[PDB]
Amino acid sequence: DALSDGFVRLCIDPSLNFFGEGCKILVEGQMTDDGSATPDAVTCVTSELDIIE
């Protein structure tokens, strides 16, 4: 930002969850046909609100 005043310049990291990403847990199990995830391929899962879909 050019409009700022001081010189110490904060640059917030794009996303949170830094604390993790060192304790990856892999859940393996079956799925129905409603889901849109490709079978037999690991995929990250962010939150809970989009697992039914």
């Binding site: 930002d1 409009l3 700022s4 005043d5 904060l10």
Partner: protein, 58 residues
Amino acid sequence: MNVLIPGIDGMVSAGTLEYTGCCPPSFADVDECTLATAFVGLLPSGPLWDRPKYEAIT
């Protein structure tokens, strides 16, 4: 000899006072755009408020 105009007391003569300059801005002045943008100034300052306060178009 001074023309003479009318009043609740007869036919009095009149005149003009000098423009002082004070006189609060009255209802005519109050405007939406003119104080909607003025109310942006009540916000704090910092890297979170600087660019939004700069780009506020009305």
